Amino acid sequence: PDYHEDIHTYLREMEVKCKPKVGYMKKQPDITNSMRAILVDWLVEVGEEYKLQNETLHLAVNYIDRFLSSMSVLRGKLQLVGTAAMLLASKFEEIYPPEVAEFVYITDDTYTKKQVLRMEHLVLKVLTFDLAAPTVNQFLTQYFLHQQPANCKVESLAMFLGELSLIDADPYLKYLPSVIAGAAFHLALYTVTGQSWPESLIRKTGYTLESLKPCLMDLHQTYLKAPQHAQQSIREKYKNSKYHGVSLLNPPETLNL
Amino acid sequence: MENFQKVEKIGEGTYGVVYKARNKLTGEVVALKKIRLTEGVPSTAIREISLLKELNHPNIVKLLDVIHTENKLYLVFEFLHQDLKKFMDASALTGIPLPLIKSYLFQLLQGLAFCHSHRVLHRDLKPQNLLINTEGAIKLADFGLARAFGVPVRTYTHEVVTLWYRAPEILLGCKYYSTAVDIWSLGCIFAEMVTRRALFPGDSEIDQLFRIFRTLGTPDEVVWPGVTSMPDYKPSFPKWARQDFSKVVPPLDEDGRSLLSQMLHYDPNKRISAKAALAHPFFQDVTKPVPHLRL
Numbered sequence: 027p028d029y030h031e032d033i034h035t036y037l038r039e040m041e042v043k044c045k046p047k048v049g050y051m052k053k054q055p056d057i058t059n060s061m062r063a064i065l066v067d068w069l070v071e072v073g074e075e076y077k078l079q080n081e082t083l084h085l086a087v088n089y090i091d092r093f094l095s096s097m098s099v100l101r102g103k104l105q106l107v108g109t110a111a112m113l114l115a116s117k118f119e120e121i122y123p124p125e126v127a128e129f130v131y132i133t134d135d136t137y138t139k140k141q142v143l144r145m146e147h148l149v150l151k152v153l154t155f156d157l158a159a160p161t162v163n164q165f166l167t168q169y170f171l172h173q174q175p176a177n178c179k180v181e182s183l184a185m186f187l188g189e190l191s192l193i194d195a196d197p198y199l200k201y202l203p204s205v206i207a208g209a210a211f212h213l214a215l216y217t218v219t220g221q222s223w224p225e226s227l228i229r230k231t232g233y234t235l236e237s238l239k240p241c242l243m244d245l246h247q248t249y250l251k252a253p254q255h256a257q258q259s260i261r262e263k264y265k266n267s268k269y270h271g272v273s274l275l276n277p278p279e280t281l282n283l
Numbered sequence: 284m285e286n287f288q289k290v291e292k293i294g295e296g297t298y299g300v301v302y303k304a305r306n307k308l309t310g311e312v313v314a315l316k317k318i319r320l321t322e323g324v325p326s327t328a329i330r331e332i333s334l335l336k337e338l339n340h341p342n343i344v345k346l347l348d349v350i351h352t353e354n355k356l357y358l359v360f361e362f363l364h365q366d367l368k369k370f371m372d373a374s375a376l377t378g379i380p381l382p383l384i385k386s387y388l389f390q391l392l393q394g395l396a397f398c399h400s401h402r403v404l405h406r407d408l409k410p411q412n413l414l415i416n417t418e419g420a421i422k423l424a425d426f427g428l429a430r431a432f433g434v435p436v437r438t439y440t441h442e443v444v445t446l447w448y449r450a451p452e453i454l455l456g457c458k459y460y461s462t463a464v465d466i467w468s469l470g471c472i473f474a475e476m477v478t479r480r481a482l483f484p485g486d487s488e489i490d491q492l493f494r495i496f497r498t499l500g501t502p503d504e505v506v507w508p509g510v511t512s513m514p515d516y517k518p519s520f521p522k523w524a525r526q527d528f529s530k531v532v533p534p535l536d537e538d539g540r541s542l543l544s545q546m547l548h549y550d551p552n553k554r555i556s557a558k559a560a561l562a563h564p565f566f567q568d569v570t571k572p573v574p575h576l577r578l
């Protein structure tokens with residue numbers, strides 16, 4: 027109850043610091059946005075396979091993007107980075123995290139157990155143990171406390187949209203987690219109930235509906251093009267009855283902002 | 284790592300063995316937390332380092348350094364003189380003066396308030412996790428079971444908190460942890476400082492629960508809405524009456540009893556927050572007395 031407003035202010039400050047270099051992929055000579063998408067999409071499958079929290083997936087990406095912001099990685103080792111990030115994210119976030127042997131397994135035995143653990147050690151070094159990173163998901167759940175009243179279809183849609191942002195480094199690195207979350211939450215609230223970014227949240231976040239526009243225009247695009255996108259794990263994930271089959275909901279043709 | 288000379292062992296705890304050590308070069312006396320190194324870096328350690336690096340406060344024990352090597356992981360901590368549990372034992376005959384109890388609770392509440400408004404749950408507050416010095420300070424320690432609650436934290440099916448200091452919500456099987464669980468713990472410790480005896484010393488999970496019921500009265504829908512719908516609630520629960528707090532914590536004044544019942548409020552939604560507790564009439568004349576530490 028009382029700590030909430032402080033946690034928003036603190037999380038808002040923390041996302042500026044735990045932010046990856048915007049155009050880091052152009053400084054990565056062997057990999058491209060495409061390959062990152064494939065990896066992130068694979069991690070969603072990994073996530074659904076081992077029934078891990080969505081927050082674990084979010085963290086794992088944050089770690090990956092930060093690690094790749096300061097370490098040149100050849101394509102053949104990108105997955106080893108991804109697998110280590112997931113293991114670390116699982117360790118930070120999951121109550122009972124999956125055994126290392128399990129993570130070694132899902133790579134089709136590309137890497138050995140030693141290779142994954144030595145990588146984990148290196149990811150920790152590069153991130154300097156700063157793993158308590160703030161996610162789009164963290165902001166979404168905080169934003170949800172402002173629905174009048176709560177709606178799970180609204181929530182499930184926002185989550186889906188916010189999850190979809192993880193796959194495409196272009197353009198979503200341009201936006202802080204809190205901004206993506208604001209866009210996702212408004213778009214979900216608009217598709218489902220027809221309402222808009224609420225007055226109470228404008229006051230809390232400082233973001234006017236106007237300011238979220240550049241992000242909304244991009245997100246709405248991903249949503250509209252989502253069925254044709256090369257990566258499908260997320261749409262599959264969210265057509266489940268658990269998430270109210272929201273990935274099957276038709277996006278509005280114009281946001282009319 | 285070749286800078287530190289190990290002085291002596293000072294106890295095991297969650298992550299692993301802990302040593303008092305000295306910095307051969309600066310002279311600084313530290314607490315070394317050693318970890319042997321194969322399932323990777325232990326979950327508890329990853330969480331402890333990660334979260335403590337953020338929590339810089341006078342009433343939270345400072346993580347000074349993390350030394351990353353080949354086969355060993357060392358966590359360097361500021362050094363304090365003993366744990367509250369040991370100080371309580373030394374006080375057994377004489378008792379901890381009420382001013383010092385007030386001072387300790389005030390400080391702990393500041394530490395906890397800092398933790399919570401930085402989305403960190405401690406989850407394991409017990410007198411052997413609280414550390415004191417000769418200068419009258421008290422600090423939160425062992426963040427091995429600590430958790431970040433940017434998203435709500437799901438509860439373990441096999442719970443790994445202490446039994447005696449566990450909140451009733453957890454025992455009745457609610458889905459998520461809460462800031463309120465940390466407040467409950469301090470409440471139990473607060474009463475224990477006052478009475479020289481543990482407030483609810485349970486054998487088993489159900490013994491713990493009933494001990495909370497015998498003292499504070501069996502909760503119902505009027506007191507705590509949704510109590511009976513919780514997973515581990517049983518209709519056949521014995522219905523005890525609430526007991527006069529002046530017979531539970533006799534040496535406490537009206538303010539002391541006022542805060543304590545708010546700290547032990549049944550509903551976790553209406554239990555006093557650390558932040559609010561600091562502004563309670565009880566701490567209006569708080570000072571910072573010095574303890575007398577043995578050995």
Ligand SMILES: COc1cc(Nc2ncc3c(C)nc(-c4ccccc4)n3n2)cc(OC)c1OC
Binds near residue numbers: 362
């Ligand atoms: C716990 O009892 C004593 C503590 C300390 N000091 C101290 N300072 C810092 C510290 C940290 C970060 N973690 C621990 C710890 C150790 C073991 C079990 C749980 C926690 N400690 N202990 C020193 C003693 O002797 C001087 C004690 O024995 C009386």
